[PDB]
Amino acid sequence: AMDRHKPKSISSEIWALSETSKEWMSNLRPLEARIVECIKYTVCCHISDMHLHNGVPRYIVNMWTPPEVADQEMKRQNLIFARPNVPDLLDLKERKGVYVKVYPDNGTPTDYQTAENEIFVRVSLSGQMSPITREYLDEVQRQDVTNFLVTIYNESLESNLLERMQEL
């Protein structure tokens, strides 16, 4: 139904997959929230894309999977966490749970305390990365994530979309 509103920079399949999520639907600004949620997903895909550890994908992406499935994954890997929300990714190399946060943001996100087995990737819409994020992500990951963010940021400046997302 909202298809006319999909940014060019979001893939059709990610946009379609986002219909399985009630999160953006619960927001008072649902289109803006849906775009941000798709940005978050896309960032998870760039972090994980073709990155291997011991010959197989380094990461398990839990975002947009059922929490009971993510729990199966966490139990099978013995990577267990105690937040209400499950990590967005499991990093099987570092043995960490990864949470991704997107800041509609002129500015660089600030790092705040996490548990020892957690990493919080914190990125702005304008392509900025928190200090802990920049250190955690490798050069290829930083490039892939930032090039995507800058692409959608620059698309959003061509309409009222960036301003609207800043109104989240």
Numbering used by the authors: 0 to 167
Question: Anything the authors wrote about it?
Answer:
The three largest gene segments of the Thogotoviruses, THOV, DHOV and JOSV are homologous to those of IAV and code for the heterotrimeric polymerase. In this paper we present the atomic structures of the putative PB2 cap binding and 627 domains of THOV and the putative PA N-terminal endonuclease domains of THOV and DHOV. Despite very low sequence homologies, all domains have similar folds to those of the corresponding IAV polymerase domains. However, the critical active site residues in the putative cap binding and endonuclease domains are not conserved in THOV and DHOV and, contrary to the case of IAV polymerase, neither domain shows the expected in vitro biochemical activity.
To overcome this problem, we produced the homologous domain from DHOV PA (40% identity between full-length THOV and DHOV PA, 29% for the N-terminal part), which readily crystallized and the structure was solved by the Single wavelength Anomalous Dispersion (SAD) method using seleno-methionine labelled protein. The resultant model was then used to solve the THOV PA-Nter structure by molecular replacement. The three domains clearly have the same fold, and THOV and DHOV PA-Nter are very similar. For THOV and DHOV PA-Nter the putative active site is more like an extended groove and furthermore, is positively charged. Indeed of the cation binding residues, only an equivalent of influenza Asp108 (PD motif) is found in THOV and DHOV PA-Nter, respectively Asp-86 and Asp-87. The extra positive charge in the putative active sites of THOV and DHOV PA-Nter arises from the replacement of acidic residues and the introduction of extra lysines (Lys38, Lys61 and Lys97 for THOV and Lys39 and Lys100 for DHOV PA-Nter). Using the Thermofluor assay to measure apparent melting temperature (Tm), we found that in the absence of any divalent cations, the Tm of THOV and DHOV PA-Nter domains were respectively 41 and 53°C compared with 44°C for IAV. For the DHOV domain, which is already more stable, addition of these ions has little effect, giving no indication of cation binding. Finally, neither THOV nor DHOV PA-Nter show any nuclease activity against various RNAs under conditions where IAV PA-Nter does. Our structural and biochemical results therefore strongly suggest that THOV and DHOV PA-Nter domains neither bind divalent cations nor are active endonucleases.
